[PDB]
């Protein structure tokens, strides 16, 4: 079995207890009680009716539901390899990064290479 919710009061409708209504547009309403039913037929607004759950929740009364959204104070904690880099050697080369004389000497080599490049290019142009 199941329990349901009055359209008007928003109340548990234990089985059998209460009425049901089926408008021509196929909207199925349920009513715990003829009180709610009669108000509905009067075309009242539960948000204006005071004892109703809609008014309750629209005026923010009994607000023990929500508390807050949690936040984690840390990082993802994965400086992992990219599946083709061998993380051990990856960290080894990351540590070799400081004391950058290796890359500096490669730059100096390609630098004298650019020197000789302009030189030999001018030579061929001559």
């Amino acid at each position: 079995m199941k329990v349901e919710i009055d359209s008007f009061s928003g109340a548990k409708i234990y089985p059998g207890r209460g009425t049901l209504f089926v408008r021509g547009d196929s909207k199925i309403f349920r009513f715990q009680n003829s009180k709610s039913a009669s108000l509905f037929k009067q075309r009242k607004n539960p948000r204006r009716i005071a004892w109703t759950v809609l008014f309750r929740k629209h005026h923010k009364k009994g607000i023990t539901e929500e508390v807050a959204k949690k936040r984690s104070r840390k990082t993802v904690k994965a400086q992992r390899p990219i599946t083709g880099a061998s993380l051990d050697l990856i960290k080894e080369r990351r540590s070799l990064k400081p004391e950058v004389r290796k890359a500096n000497r490669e730059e100096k080599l390609k630098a004298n290479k650019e020197k000789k490049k302009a030189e030999k290019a001018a030579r061929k142009a001559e």
Binding site: R80, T83, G84, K97, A103
Partner: protein, 171 residues
């Protein structure tokens, strides 16, 4: 019922055909993002805790976030939203869904684990699927490894070896 559970760090996933109707009555009347007890559903899941991610009910209509009901509804959905892909730019569309409350109407419930309990799970925790792709961007690789601003991502590159015939290559 079925529990399509996932462990996102291991990247693993498995369906579990559940009974113990009352140990899923616990799951009844539950929203998305909420976390209930593995032990409460199953001592095989003792100590674990999941998070109700969502699920498909009968007629395959998924659970959508934010609507706050168990019953099905027809929403005039639009782009940038679950449960509808547009086959044209500008197309809004009316589709039927089920909402963000849990009940017997559901058939498959999609769960994600946030904590690993005391025991181990056969198809989730004992296994771990790898990262199918490596980062294709320079700085993403560089920060993923923690190298420097200048540590030559070009040579820290990923190389994924595959053989066409006997000729093999990393592409």
């Amino acid at each position: 019922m079925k529990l399509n559970i996932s462990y996102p760090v291991n990247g693993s996933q498995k369906t579990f055909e559940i009974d113990d109707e009352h140990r899923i009555r616990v799951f009844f009347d539950k929203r998305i993002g909420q976390e209930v007890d593995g032990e409460a559903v199953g001592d095989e899941f003792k100590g674990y805790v999941f998070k109700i991610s969502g699920g498909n009910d009968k007629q395959g209509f998924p659970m959508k976030q934010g609507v706050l009901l168990p019953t099905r509804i027809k929403l005039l959905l639009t782009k940038n939203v679950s449960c509808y892909r547009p086959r044209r730019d500008g197309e809004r569309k009316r589709k039927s869904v089920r909402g963000a409350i849990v009940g017997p109407d559901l058939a498959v419930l999609a769960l994600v684990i946030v904590k690993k309990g005391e025991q181990e799970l056969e198809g989730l925790t004992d296994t771990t699927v790898p990262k199918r792709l490596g980062p294709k961007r320079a700085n993403n690789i560089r920060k993923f490894f923690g190298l420097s601003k200048e540590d030559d991502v070009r040579d820290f590159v990923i190389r994924r070896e595959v053989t066409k015939g006997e000729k093999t290559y990393t592409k």
